Structure formats: structure tokens, C-alpha cells
Design an enzyme around this catalytic site. Structure first.
Site: not given
Ligand SMILES: Nc1nc(F)nc2c1ncn2[C@@H]1O[C@H](CO)[C@@H](O)[C@H]1O
Ligand SMILES: Nc1nc(F)nc2c1ncn2[C@@H]1O[C@H](CO)[C@@H](O)[C@H]1O
Lengths: 331, 331
Positions: B44, B110, B203, B232-233, B265
Site C-alpha cells: 500500500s 485506469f 517491452n 528495452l527501457g 503507445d
Molecule cells: N497507505 C495507507 N495509509 C493509511 F493511512 N491508511 C491506509 C493505507 N492503505 C490502506 N489503508 C487503510 O487500511 C484499511 C485496512 O487496514 C483500509 O480501509 C484503508 O482505508
Molecule cells: N490492463 C489494461 N487493459 C487495457 F485495455 N488498457 C490498459 C490496461 N492498463 C493500462 N491500460 C492503458 O494503457 C495506457 C498506457 O499504455 C493507459 O492510458 C491506460 O488507459
């Protein structure tokens, strides 16, 4: 030594207050994580589900303590939209008087994706949460008295330290629960949250992350805290004393693995509720494990119900008749 | 052998049409990815930024082909909200007549988080995208003639295969560009998108993922396609013939690493635009590398500008006077 009056026996929960957007990926994150490409991932998961629920670690923990009948105050920062969420929490006995309501910013947003193995990858946009650094625990204590415990959950990173420092100078017992923020916090930022903690709560991944970023050994940590509580997923939980005497409690077996969001928060609330009612470490973790599995079996963090009879029966099934009777009596 | 008239020389871009929510994590994803915990991540990231931009791989590629002056038709499914995005695309010469507009569902979303190293972790909620499986390329070809090339980008997984099958029976040249969907697609689903492709674009991570999930060796793949293009980045791009004769082109050096969303893209659009105008493989990848870095240097996928004089100067700087003159002349 704080001479101010005891709130008796309120838990103050500090930490995030959010709206959670939970999604499911019908595949396996690990299968997509090539060990030689972890240096710079490029991951995108097409999800088949998106639902919104009340969230934030402090909202989650306060809710559960309230459901279990505990006295609890929620302390965190939310947007103007908080009025509705406040009613939902108040309905379960949560004191929301000390939530800071932002005049300009939006309640924080959690966007989370869960895979078939209950792994999770998520972002958290703070919004109004960043104003938590403006909250003074002193003013809360002034109003309701000294809490028996302040939980320092994931929050605005500056707020997490300020709240902890306030607990230290006010002589309030506190639980360090940085779990969700460990990724964002520097080793220096993690180290200053730990000393003097009544409890340190993490899962095992987070425990390794903490040690990895702090540069600390387990011994370095145990010398600073009264108890380490480390959840182990399907292997239950370890409760370790500074010695360390270790008590282990296994999970309550699940009937489903629906959504693991908030499972840790629920364990912590049940466990602390147990501790507040004078149960020992083993019995408290047994109660915690039950609230935990109830969250696992429902979607969202506060969408579980509490049936007193169903609880006793389940506790009996996993831990035996003695545990179930001692626990249910306390509530 | 398709006897229908040539669209001359239109590229049809199939793939996703979305709104992108882009966020930044001011830390390092890798630092949080413990190799022994990759079996079941719990990640997270507290982000410090959130901005919304037009997106979807097909919207991105169509936009760039249009900016570069190419004839291009966008083929995908969007929600009723698409009218505004349509005007934005039409302003750069994109033919949007064949976008399917959902009567009930929302344009796809997205949600992406980028770290300090340009690594990215993201979810994609399909919404109206799922209706792309209802689009018939035959009806598109009927209206505008046979495209010189159909790009099969990340899309509704069923649509990706149906579109490819349609290209195969209509005898249309196609580029397999499954990149963004490789995580969701099964090895069986990946394998059926590849045979007979004029180009395969990925890639290097995606190339490894593809081979890992297909069970294929590089040889198995090269026997089925006319050309493999593997970015290749920071090391540029490899263009590999079935032999394989390999042409390598290095990056255009960046002045910033702002936001890497849509860089692939853009490379693909520039490269294909180059190929359409009769440039060779090296020159086409050089043009592609330029549009690519312009996206890298801006936030969002379609927020870059095209200055003809600035382009020539930059191309000169990275590739020399000959490349720059040959490229700019073609446009
Ligand atoms: N990086 C984060 N920072 C803070 F302050 N809160 C977070 C973070 N990631 C998840 N959550 C919250 O954790 C809950 C689940 O444990 C969830 O309900 C979610 O809201
Ligand atoms: N899992 C995905 N499936 C599809 F159909 N589209 C995706 C996915 N992940 C990223 N994007 C799109 O890729 C764009 C950047 O290349 C971004 O503009 C984003 O909208």
C-alpha cells in the site's frame, strides 16, 4: 506521571478515515512478478469487480471496538463529506467528536486490488488526512480524560509521529500500529514510532520490512516495547514478550476467503477489546482471530455482523469450550 | 486474398479507451518488495499526487498517429461520456466514427501509481470496454476500406482474440500489441493472438512474461511473426527479424523522467507512422523513440506537443544529421 482524570476505560483510535474502492483481479499477482524484473515493475491488472465501502484503519478499528461494546473515540481528519460516515460510526457507539473536518479537502481514497490468493496491491490518496497533523491529542484528553490506550495507526506520516510524541509526554500508553504506512515511512520515521510502545502490531511481512528499513534486529525492538504482536496469515498470530516468552494462537478456520481488507484492523480491535476487559494474551488473540475471520468472510471492512451465539459456537470449534466461555462472558 | 478496396493508407487502432487517474509514490517500489514475500504481497503506497488524463492504449496510439499527420481510425468501446473525448481526438484528425458507445456502462478507468524509478503498478476497470467484443471489424472495413494495418492493443480480452481472428479471415495485416493485458491473459489466450502478426510489440519484461506464460521459446515465436519489436527501457529498442537479423536503436536522451504512462503507445505510433511513410526499421524506431521521450517528459499520455523544428534538432542530437533529415522529410 499524568495527574489528569482517567477516561475509563476509553480507547482512542488515531489513524486514517477513508472511502475504500475494492476491486478483484481473477488471477495471481505472484505469477506476474518475475524475480528478475522486480527491480522496476510494470504491472497492470484488469479487474472484474469494483465496490466502495467505508474505510481507513482508524474508522475500521473504532467500528469494531464499538460493535464489540467498547468505549472508543475516533481521532483523525476527514473531508466535509464525513457527516454520513459519522452517522454510520455513531450507530455502533463510536465517539466522533474529535474528528477534524477539513474545510477544503476531500476524505482520503484507498484504491485496492485483491488477487485469487488474497494478496493485495493498493494506493492511498490522503486528501483531508494530511490535516491530522493539526490535531492535538492534548485537547482530546482534556475533553474525555486519559484513554487507557491510544492506537497509533497508519495516518498522515507527520501526524503518526506527533501523536506518538504527545502520548509520550502525556504519559499515555500507546500501541504502535504503523503497518499500512511502512512502505512510505523512512527507517528514521519508523524508528521514532516504536520506543515505549505498549504493543507493536504488524504482520510478518511488515515485521521483516520494519527490521529491513530500521536496520534493527529483533532484540533492538523487543528492548523498547512491552509486547510484539505479529499476525502470521493462515498460521495465526505470535504474541512475544521482551524475553521472549511467546504465545501462539492459530486462526479461526474460514468458510470463505472473500476479501482480506481490514482483517488486521479487526484482529487488533478484538484483541485490544479483549485486553481491556481483563482477558489474558491468549484469550484476547482468540477473540481477535474471530473478528478477523468475520471480516475475511465479508466484502469491505465494516460489513460484518456480530451474533453473540454464533461467536461462542465458532470460538468453541477452533479453541475449545473453555476459551469460548471465558471470552463470551467478558463481552 | 481480400478483394475489397484499400482504405489507403489508414491504420485502424483497436484497444482500450479510458480515463487515466495517475498518482505518484515518492519512494521505491522495489525497496518494498521483499523477495521472500513476493508469494503473497501486501502493498500500500501513500501517494502525493493524483491527476486525471485521457487514456486507453487505442486512444493514445490514435492520438499520436493523428498528431504526426497519419490517417487513423479508432475502434473500441466507450461510455456515453465519450462525446467530449471524441472532440479531443477529432481535433487531431482521429476518425472516431467506429467507436461503440455503450448505452449503460461507463468509460473504463485506469488507476496507476508511479514510483521514483518510473516503475508502475495499476488496475484497470473495464466498464464499457467489455462491449468491444460486440464490434465487428468487417463493418469498419466495409465503411472505410481495408486498413494497411490493424493494431490489436490491450482491450476486452475476448475482443482481442475476436479482432485478431477477423483480421486473419479478412486478410488484414495486424500488429499484436497485447502488452498491457498480458497479466490477465492465460497462456492459451496469449498464444492465439500471435500467429501471422506483421509485428509483435512488447517491452522486455512483457517479452519474458509472454514466453513464461505461453511456454514458447523465442524460436517458436519468431516462426509465426514477421517482426518482433521489443523496447528495452533506457537501452532503446530491438527490432528482430525471424532469422534473426537484429536492428537496435538507442533512446532519445530525456531531460526529465516525469511520467512514463503511454511511452510504449507513443513509440508504437511513431514507429508505425514511420513504417507507413516508407521509412526503414531503423529510421522508424528513431522517430518512435522521439515521440516516446516526449511522452516521458510530460504528465499524461496525450499531453505532449509536436514542434517540427524541435523534433529535427533532437533527432539530430541523438542519431545524427542523416536520420533527422530523412525522418522529418517523411512527415
Ligand atoms: N497507505 C495507507 N495509509 C493509511 F493511512 N491508511 C491506509 C493505507 N492503505 C490502506 N489503508 C487503510 O487500511 C484499511 C485496512 O487496514 C483500509 O480501509 C484503508 O482505508
Ligand atoms: N490492463 C489494461 N487493459 C487495457 F485495455 N488498457 C490498459 C490496461 N492498463 C493500462 N491500460 C492503458 O494503457 C495506457 C498506457 O499504455 C493507459 O492510458 C491506460 O488507459
Amino acid at each position: 506521571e499524568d495527574l489528569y482524570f482517567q477516561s475509563h476505560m476509553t480507547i482512542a483510535v488515531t489513524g486514517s478515515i477513508a472511502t475504500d474502492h475494492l476491486m478483484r483481479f481473477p488471477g495471481r499477482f505472484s505469477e506476474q512478478l518475475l524475480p528478475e524484473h522486480l527491480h522496476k515493475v510494470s504491472l497492470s491488472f484488469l479487474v472484474d469487480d469494483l465496490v466502495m465501502h467505508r474505510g481507513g484503519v482508524a474508522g475500521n478499528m473504532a467500528f469494531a471496538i464499538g460493535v464489540l461494546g467498547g468505549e472508543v473515540a475516533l481521532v483523525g481528519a476527514a473531508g466535509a463529506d464525513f457527516a454520513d460516515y459519522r452517522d454510520w460510526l455513531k450507530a455502533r457507539g463510536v465517539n466522533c467528536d474529535h474528528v477534524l473536518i477539513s474545510e477544503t479537502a476531500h476524505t482520503a481514497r484507498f484504491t485496492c486490488t485483491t488477487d485469487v490468493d488474497m494478496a493485495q496491491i493498493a494506493s492511498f490518496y490522503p486528501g483531508a488526512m494530511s490535516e491530522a497533523r493539526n490535531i492535538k491529542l492534548a485537547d482530546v484528553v482534556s475533553a474525555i480524560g486519559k484513554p487507557e490506550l491510544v492506537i497509533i495507526g497508519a495516518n498522515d506520516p507527520e501526524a503518526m509521529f506527533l501523536h506518538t510524541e504527545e502520548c509520550r509526554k502525556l504519559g499515555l500508553a500507546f500501541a504502535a500500529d504503523p503497518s499500512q504506512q511502512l512502505a512510505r515511512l523512512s527507517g528514521e520515521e519508523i524508528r521514532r514510532l516504536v520506543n515505549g510502545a505498549a504493543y507493536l502490531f504488524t504482520n510478518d511481512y511488515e515485521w521483516d520490512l520494519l527490521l529491513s528499513k530500521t536496520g534493527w534486529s529483533e532484540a533492538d525492538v523487543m528492548a523498547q516495547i512491552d509486547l510484539r504482536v505479529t499476525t502470521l496469515g493462515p498460521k495465526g498470530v505470535d504474541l512475544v514478550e521482551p524475553d521472549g516468552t511467546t504465545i501462539h494462537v492459530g486462526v479461526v478456520p474460514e468458510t470463505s476467503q472473500t476479501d482480506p481488507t481490514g482483517v488486521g484492523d479487526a484482529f487488533r480491535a478484538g484483541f485490544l477489546t479483549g485486553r481491556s476487559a481483563g482477558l489474558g494474551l491468549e484469550r484476547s488473540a482468540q477473540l481477535g482471530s474471530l473478528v478477523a475471520v468475520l471480516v475475511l468472510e465479508s466484502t469491505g471492512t465494516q460489513e460484518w455482523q456480530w451474533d453473540y451465539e454464533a461467536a461462542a459456537s465458532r470460538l468453541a470449534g477452533a479453541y475449545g469450550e473453555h476459551a469460548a466461555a471465558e471470552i463470551v462472558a467478558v463481552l
